[PDB]
Design a protein around this nucleic acid. Structure first.
Ligand SMILES: [Mg+2]
Ligand SMILES: [Mg+2]
Ligand SMILES: [Zn+2]
Lengths: 94, 135, 71, 38, 109
RNA sequence: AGCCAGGAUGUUGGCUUAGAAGCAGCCAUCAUUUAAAGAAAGCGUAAUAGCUCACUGGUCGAGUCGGCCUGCGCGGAAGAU
């Protein structure tokens, strides 16, 4: 159902991460399984409007990156404390 | 009126309130009242907000207070010179970091919880906001 | 010209005061043998051509007294 | 009127109008609702 | 409120009655009391008359089943219909009563 | 959104009802007719009554309603040569 267009984090660290949050993106990472994990920068308002749906925490989520289409499922999320927005997502491979 | 029944010591240093909060996810009920500002709450404020909420839902529903003071404020009396020892205790406070969920409620409609929390938000020294049950 | 439904539960139901406790405690129970005859005799000023129309209408008024429907 | 720092629509027929940079509240039904310095 | 399926549903409820119609009344009802309505509802099934008051712009969806587009374009003003399903007449006569009995509208159809 | 029109019956819903008819109030808040009529949102009532709204039809015809993230503003804001 869900399909997420995404870029690749070329720089990692909190300075680039807070630049990336202030640029109205936010980072996340896919891990689990046999492959080395993959770090993602992606758009904020898109997924912020996705995640209110209850199906977001249940169904299987496809993500387009490099053209490659990856099937994952959501595990945990670093929400910001008081504003209604997000910081970081841990995705788990299938 | 909310007060530790026994403490390890009489007094405590002043301390600081640097950083953010822990108790952030809504974990008991359906609706939550969360701190946005940064400061400290008295037991009188907490009890008055509790009375406002219980007034608005009149009796019915279950209400959680996720906070408890466990910090005194020493106050030297009127017309006492400086020094001569740290003052006596007159009121207890709770440390507030931003994003701390303060109150929690289950068993009512959403609009009623919303208006009850905006009644109790005026009882408080800080800006507070409204949150739902999440994952 | 037609008698009210609130007073008919003092001569054909069993209670002599009013409710007291509408949905806190049941006092008695009402079957359908008491009200079909009264609904049949009261076909002078009603709303509804079918008898089914005012059947549940007359029954549903008495429910706020701590009475049990028996059907 | 009554001049309170925070003004509210009080009924169905209360109304918010800015006049001379000052907020005023007018009711068509009840004269008590009339307010200023919002 | 009013679902699009609800607006479909009123059409699907009325259209088979229109298919099972003999003649009908398209009137004006500019002001009729509840006590002026309930006896007319009684006389409805009491003579076998099936009357409805619809969204007046929402009829031609069900009326468009020719041969029932006959007096189609009579939607101006508030209207209402009364189909008769047995012995045509005895439904239009029921409003030919009130056309001189309630001192109001000339019926449009 | 205006404007034309409706907006009931059982029903004063039970009651400590002095007196309560949605009409301060304690309880649930359910049934007819239809397009709708909350057994009720709120002013009035000695208690009624009378005048609105939540709802529905028509007239008119292109946008309309208030939630969020935000930059900048407004009131709040009165002292003494
Ligand atoms: Mg640094
Ligand atoms: Mg000035
Ligand atoms: Zn007003």
């Amino acid at each position: 159902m869900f399909t997420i267009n995404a870029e690749v984090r070329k720089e990692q660290g909190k300075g680039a991460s807070r630049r990336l949050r202030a640029a109205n993106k936010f980072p996340a990472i896919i891990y689990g399984g046999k492959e080395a994990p993959l770090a993602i920068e992606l758009d904020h308002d898109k997924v912020m409007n996705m995640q209110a749906k209850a199906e977001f925490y249940s169904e299987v989520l496809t993500i387009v990156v490099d053209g490659k289409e990856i099937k994952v499922k959501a595990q945990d999320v670093q929400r910001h404390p008081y504003k209604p927005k997000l910081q970081h997502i841990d995705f788990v491979r299938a | 009126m909310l007060q530790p029944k026994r403490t390890k010591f009489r007094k405590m240093h002043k301390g600081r309130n640097r950083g953010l909060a822990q108790g952030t996810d809504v974990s008991f009920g359906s609706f939550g009242l969360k701190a946005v500002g940064r400061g400290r709450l008295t037991a009188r404020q907490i009890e008055a907000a509790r009375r406002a909420m219980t007034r608005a839902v009149k009796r019915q529903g279950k209400i959680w207070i996720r906070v408890f003071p466990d910090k005194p404020i020493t106050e030297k009396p009127l017309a006492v010179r400086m020094g001569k020892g740290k003052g006596n205790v007159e009121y207890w406070v709770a440390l507030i970091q931003p994003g701390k969920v303060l109150y929690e409620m289950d068993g009512v409609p959403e609009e009623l919880a919303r208006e009850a929390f905006k009644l109790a938000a005026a009882k408080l020294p800080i800006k507070t906001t409204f949150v739902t049950k999440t994952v | 010209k037609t008698p009210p439904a609130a007073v008919l539960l003092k001569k054909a139901a069993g209670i002599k005061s009013g409710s007291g406790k509408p949905n806190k405690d049941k006092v008695g129970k009402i079957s359908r043998a008491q009200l079909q005859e009264i609904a049949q005799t009261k076909a002078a000023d009603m709303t509804g051509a079918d008898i089914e129309a005012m059947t549940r209408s007359i029954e549903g008024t008495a429910r706020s007294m701590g009475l049990v429907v028996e059907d | 009127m009554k001049v309170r720092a925070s003004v509210k629509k009080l009924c169905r027929n209360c109304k918010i109008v800015k006049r001379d940079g000052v907020i005023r509240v007018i009711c068509s039904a009840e004269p008590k609702h009339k307010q200023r310095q919002g | 409120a009013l679902n699009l399926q609800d607006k479909q549903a009123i059409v699907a409820e009325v259209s088979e009655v229109a298919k099972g119609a003999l003649s009908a009344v398209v009137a004006d009802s500019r002001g009729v009391t509840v006590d002026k309505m309930t006896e007319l509802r009684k006389a409805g099934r009491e003579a076998g008359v099936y009357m409805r008051v619809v969204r007046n712009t929402l009829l031609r969806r069900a009326v468009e089943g020719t041969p029932f587009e006959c007096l189609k374009d009579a939607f101006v003003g508030p209207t209402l219909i009364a189909y008769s399903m047995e012995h045509p007449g005895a439904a239009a006569r029921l409003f030919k009563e009130f056309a001189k009995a309630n001192a109001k509208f000339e019926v449009k159809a």
